[PDB]
Amino acid sequence: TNLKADPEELFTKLEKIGKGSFGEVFKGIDNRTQKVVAIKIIDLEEAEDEIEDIQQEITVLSQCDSPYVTKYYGSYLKDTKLWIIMEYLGGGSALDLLEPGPLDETQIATILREILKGLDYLHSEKKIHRDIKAANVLLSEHGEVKLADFGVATPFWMAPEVIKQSAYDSKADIWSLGITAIELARGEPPHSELHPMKVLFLIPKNNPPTLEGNYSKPLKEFVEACLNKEPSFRPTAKELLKHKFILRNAKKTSYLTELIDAHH
Amino acid sequence: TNLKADPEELFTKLEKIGKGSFGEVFKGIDNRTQKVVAIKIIDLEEAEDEIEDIQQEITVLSQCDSPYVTKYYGSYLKDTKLWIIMEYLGGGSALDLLEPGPLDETQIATILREILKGLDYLHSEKKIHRDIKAANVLLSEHGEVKLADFGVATPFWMAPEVIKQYDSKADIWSLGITAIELARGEPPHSELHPMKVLFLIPKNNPPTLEGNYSKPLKEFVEACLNKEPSFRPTAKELLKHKFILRNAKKTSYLTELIDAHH
Ligand SMILES: Cc1cccc(-c2ccc(-c3cc4cnc(NC(CO)CO)nc4n(CCCCN)c3=O)c(Cl)c2)n1
Numbered sequence: 001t002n003l004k005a006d007p008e009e010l011f012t013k014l015e016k017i018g019k020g021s022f023g024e025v026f027k028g029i030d031n032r033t034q035k036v037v038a039i040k041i042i043d044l045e046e047a048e049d050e051i052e053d054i055q056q057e058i059t060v061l062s063q064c065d066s067p068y069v070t071k072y073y074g075s076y077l078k079d080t081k082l083w084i085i086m087e088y089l090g091g092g093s094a095l096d097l098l099e100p101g102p103l104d105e106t107q108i109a110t111i112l113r114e115i116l117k118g119l120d121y122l123h124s125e126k127k128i129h130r131d132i133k134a135a136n137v138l139l140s141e142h143g144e145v146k147l148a149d150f151g152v153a154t155p156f157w158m159a160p161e162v163i164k165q166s167a168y169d170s171k172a173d174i175w176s177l178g179i180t181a182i183e184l185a186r187g188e189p190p191h192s193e194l195h196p197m198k199v200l201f202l203i204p205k206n207n208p209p210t211l212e213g214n215y216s217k218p219l220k221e222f223v224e225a226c227l228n229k230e231p232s233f234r235p236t237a238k239e240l241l242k243h244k245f246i247l248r249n250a251k252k253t254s255y256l257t258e259l260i261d262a263h264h
Numbered sequence: 265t266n267l268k269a270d271p272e273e274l275f276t277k278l279e280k281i282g283k284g285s286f287g288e289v290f291k292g293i294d295n296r297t298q299k300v301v302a303i304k305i306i307d308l309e310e311a312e313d314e315i316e317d318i319q320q321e322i323t324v325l326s327q328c329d330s331p332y333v334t335k336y337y338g339s340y341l342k343d344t345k346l347w348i349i350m351e352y353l354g355g356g357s358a359l360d361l362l363e364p365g366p367l368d369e370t371q372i373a374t375i376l377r378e379i380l381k382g383l384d385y386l387h388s389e390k391k392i393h394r395d396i397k398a399a400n401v402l403l404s405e406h407g408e409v410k411l412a413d414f415g416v417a418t419p420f421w422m423a424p425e426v427i428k429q430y431d432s433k434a435d436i437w438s439l440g441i442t443a444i445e446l447a448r449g450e451p452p453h454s455e456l457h458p459m460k461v462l463f464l465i466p467k468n469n470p471p472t473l474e475g476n477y478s479k480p481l482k483e484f485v486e487a488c489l490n491k492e493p494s495f496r497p498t499a500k501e502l503l504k505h506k507f508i509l510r511n512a513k514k515t516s517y518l519t520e521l522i523d524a525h526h
C-alpha cells in the first residue's frame with residue numbers, strides 16, 4: 001500500500017460499477033497508460049473490524065500472477081480512504097450471463113475450463129480461492145475468464161467440510177466448482193429456494209446434489225465428480241481439465257463474445 | 265549442399281520437434297562440433313514443384329548473418345532426401361507462448377522489439393522476410409528472439425499491396441498484424457474463409473487493436489497498419505516508439521514465460 005502518491009492524481013474515477021465487498025467499485029482510467037482499471041474505495045474510518053480481512057485479500061491477490069486471476073495493481077491511502085486498483089474486465093460476470101435463460105453446454109464447458117485453469121494455478125501455488133461461484137467469475141469483453149473476490153480464510157456454494165468448520169484444502173474449491181457448474185446450467189445453486197440457515201445443516205446431512213434435467217451424461221458426471229461428500233475423492237483441477245465433458249464441449253474463449261455482447 | 269558426406273553419420277537426431285514446411289524437423293547434434301542443431305529433412309520426390317521455393321529460402325537464409333535471424337549451417341542431399349541444418353532454439357515459437365495464457369504488454373513489447381531488430385537487419389540488407397507472424401518467431405531457452413521461415417517471392421498477415429501487387433513496408437504491416445496476434449491470440453478475420461480475407465484486406469479500413477490495451481500499444485499497431493505502404497515507419501523508427509521504450513525489457517525476462525510453456 002502506497003501512502004505518498006495521490007490516487008486522485010494517478011487515476012480518473014468514472015462510473016460506479018456496484019456495491020462491492022466493504023466499499024464501492026468504480027471503472028477508472030490509469031492516467032499514465034490510459035488503460036481502464038477497476039477501483040475499489042473503502043472508507044477505513046467506517047469499516048474498522050473488517051480491516052484484517054481486507055489486508056488478507058490484498059496479500060493473496062498481490063502474491064498471484066496468472067492470466068486467470070484478476071491482476072492487483074496496488075493500493076493507496078488518501079485521508080481515511082483506501083483505494084484498491086485492480087484489472088478491469090469489461091464483459092461482466094458469469095452470473096450476469098445467466099440472466100436471460102440458459103447457457104448451452106458449449107458455453108458451460110468453455111467457462112468451466114477457464115475457471116479450472118485458474119484453480120489449477122492457485123492450487124499449484126498452495127492457495128485456495130474459497131468463494132468460487134458465478135458472481136466471482138469475471139469476463140473480459142473478448143471472452144477471457146478470470147477469478148475474482150477470494151473468500152475470507154451465504155452457504156450455497158460451501159463444501160460440507162467447510163460448513164462443519166473442519167480443516168479443508170483445495171478440494172473445497174472443487175466442490176464449489178461443482179455447485180458453480182450446476183449454477184451455470186440452472187441459473188442458481190442447489191437449495192436456492194431454502195433459507196440459508198436451513199441449507200447450513202442440509203449440506204453436511206444430505207446426499208450431495210446432482211444435476212437434474214436434459215443434460216449430456218458427461219456434464220452430469222462432471223458435477224458428480226466434483227460433488228463428493230468425501231473431499232479426498234474429488235479430482236484435482238488438472239484432472240478435471242481432461243474430463244470428457246470439458247474436452248468434448250469447450251471451445252475457444254473468443255466465442256463467448258457473442259454471449260457477452262448479448263448482455264451488454 | 266553436400267553430396268559426399270553422409271548426414272546420418274554427421275548428425276544424431278534427438279527428437280522430432282514437429283512437422284515443418286515440406287518436411288519433418290528434428291532437434292539433433294552435429295557430431296563433429298558437438299552442438300545442438302535443428303534438422304529439416306525434405307523428400308525431393310514427394311515435394312516436387314515446391315523445390316524452387318525451398319531453394320529460394322535456402323539462398324536467403326544463407327545470406328543472413330545476424331543474431332536476430334536463425335543461422336543456416338548448410339544442407340546435405342542423401343538419395344532423394346535433403347537435410348537442412350539450422351540453429352536450434354529451445355524455447356518454442358511466439359505462437360506457442362500464446363498457449364498457456366494471455367501475453368501482457370511487457371511480454372509483447374519485448375518480443376516486438378527483438379522482431380524489429382531482425383527486420384531492421386533484413387531491410388538494411390535489402391531483404392524482405394515476407395512471412396512475419398507469431399509462428400515464425402522463435403525463442404531460445406534464454407529468451408533470445410529470432411526470425412525463421414522466410415516467405416518466398418493463408419492471407420491473414422498479408423499487406424493489402426501484397427494481395428494486389430511491394431517492399432520492406434509489407435513486413436511492417438505484417439508486424440502490425442503480429443502485434444494484434446500477440447495481444448489477442450490471433451490475427452484479424454481469424455474466423456473467415458481465406459478467400460473472403462483476400463478481398464477484405466484491400467477493401468476495408470485497416471485493422472485496429474480493440475480492447476483494454478494501453479494507448480501506446482494501440483498507436484504502435486495503427487502506425488504499422490496504414491493502407492498506404494509508404495506511410496508505414498521503418499523498423500528503425502519503430503524501435504523508438506513510446507510503446508517499445510516504455511514497456512520492453514531485457515530478453516532474459518521472457519524465460520519465465522518460456523518455462524511456463526514447459
Ligand atoms: C476487499 C478487497 C481486497 C482486495 C481486493 C479487492 C477487490 C476485489 C474485486 C474488485 C473488482 C474488480 C472488478 C473488475 N472488473 C469488473 N467489471 C465487471 C463487473 O461485472 C464488468 O463491469 N468488476 C469488478 N468488480 C465488481 C464486480 C465484483 C463481482 N464479484 C470488483 O469488485 C476490486 Cl476493484 C477489488 N477487495
Ligand SMILES: Cc1cccc(-c2ccc(-c3cc4cnc(NC(CO)CO)nc4n(CCCCN)c3=O)c(Cl)c2)n1
Pocket residue numbers: 281282284285286289302303304317318319321322325334348349350351352353354355356357360399400402412413
Ligand atoms: C524450406 C526451407 C528452406 C530452408 C530452410 C528451411 C528451414 C526452416 C525452418 C527450420 C526450423 C528451425 C527450428 C529451430 N528451432 C525450433 N525449435 C523451437 C520451435 O518450437 C522449439 O522446439 N524449431 C525449428 N523449426 C520448427 C518450428 C518452425 C515454426 N514455423 C523449424 O522448422 C529449419 Cl530446420 C529449416 N526450410
